[PDB]
Amino acid sequence: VKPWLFLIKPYEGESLSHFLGRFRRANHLSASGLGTLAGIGAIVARWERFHFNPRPSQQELEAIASVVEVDAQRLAQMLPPAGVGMQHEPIRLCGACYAESPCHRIEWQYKSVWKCDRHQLKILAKCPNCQAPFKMPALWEDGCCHRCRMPFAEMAKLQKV
């Protein structure tokens, strides 16, 4: 037998925040706990809210790669590519893309993205029924608005075309 963890395979276009949240919820860890295990401290707790004041470094991502067992390049593929500007707030979601695959796309957080290219829908910045801003992607235990308990996949037919 060899040391192991509840590994999670990353999605396509998922966020670093959402992937780390899924990794934590499948390992019953905590942001401080994940950081301490990785060896980088509370920096992880920062990444879950997209505060990349000092962009996630190559070392700070290799240390994560050692723990979550995902290749460092595959890790960088959930951060915005070098030079692309993202908004850490508000957290934005497309209902149809969540119904297709239950994840949060880092591409939704780009400053330049307002339309889902494969759904032709104006992506959502707040819950379309109760105007409740979405939580951090790592905090999505499941696909529902916290205040109104409306499933994320449902919101697809409330969001405008």
């Binding site: 905090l139 235990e141 529902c144 916290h146 109104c148 308990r149």
Partner: protein
């Protein structure tokens, strides 16, 4: 055929919900407590079958998806951890609901659980193994019951009775109490003859709770429905594994020897 045998022994080894008279009268009692919104405390000796009855009750009144509002949940079934503080009780009562709270502090958590309880309009709070809670948490349970008008049903063994007798204000509101049944008397005959084919589901040897079988069972179970449950299931596993058609006297005497 060994695949069919393994499926059968998988059914046996799995804990199955089985209808009794006691579970039905418990359900009637709990419906009365719902319509009254009055606190109660079902108590009974170990392995008498309180947990399964409460689970069947909460499955009977399953939560309904509400369209205008977040869904309403009729009953909340929680089994806390041994010597767990009120923070963990609040965590469990929120997590049973679809809601979820992190960070914060104890006062924040109690406020949040008050809000989620009033939002869902929860009728009863069946706490399983109520004596696992720390005595300070019982004050919080009283506060929840008094502020939300929610019927709290304290499920546990006589240790729960001693624990609630230890403190005054905790026992103050739980005047009513339901004592569970040992099932002694002629009821053993009905329960055994029903369990012969209701649960086991094998070609019966027409035991029909025969004198030898019934007396060997009363020498091992003493009315503990859980006892007879696992004894009969394990004995059926032994009989089927060795290639026997139906159970016999030897396997019953062996399992009774290993039990007593």
């Amino acid at each position: 055929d060994d695949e069919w045998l393994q499926a059968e022994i998988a059914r046996l080894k799995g804990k199955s919900i089985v209808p009794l008279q006691q579970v039905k009268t418990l359900h009637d009692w709990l419906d009365g407590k719902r319509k009254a919104r009055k606190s109660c405390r079902v108590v009974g000796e170990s392995r008498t079958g309180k947990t399964v009855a409460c689970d069947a009750y909460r499955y009977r009144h399953k939560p309904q998806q509400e369209a205008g509002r977040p869904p309403t949940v009729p009953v909340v079934y929680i089994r806390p951890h041994q010597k767990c503080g009120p923070k963990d009780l609040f965590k469990k009562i929120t997590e049973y609901l679809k809601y979820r709270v992190t960070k914060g502090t104890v006062s924040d958590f109690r406020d949040r659980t008050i809000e989620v309880l009033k939002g869902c309009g929860v009728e009863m709070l069946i706490i399983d193994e109520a004596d696992r809670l720390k005595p300070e948490t019982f004050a919080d349970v009283r506060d929840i019951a008094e502020d939300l008008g929610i019927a709290v049903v304290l499920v546990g063994t006589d240790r729960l009775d001693a624990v609630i007798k230890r403190d005054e204000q905790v026992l103050e509101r739980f005047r009513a109490h339901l004592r569970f049944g040992k099932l002694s008397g002629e009821d053993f005959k009905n329960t055994v003859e029903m369990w012969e084919q209701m649960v086991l589901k094998l070609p019966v040897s027409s035991n029909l709770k025969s004198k030898e079988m019934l007396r060997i069972l009363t020498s091992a179970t003493e009315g503990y429905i859980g006892r007879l449950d696992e004894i009969l299931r394990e004995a059926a596993i032994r009989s089927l594994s060795r290639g026997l058609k139906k159970i016999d006297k030897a396997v019953l005497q062996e399992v009774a020897k290993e039990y007593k």
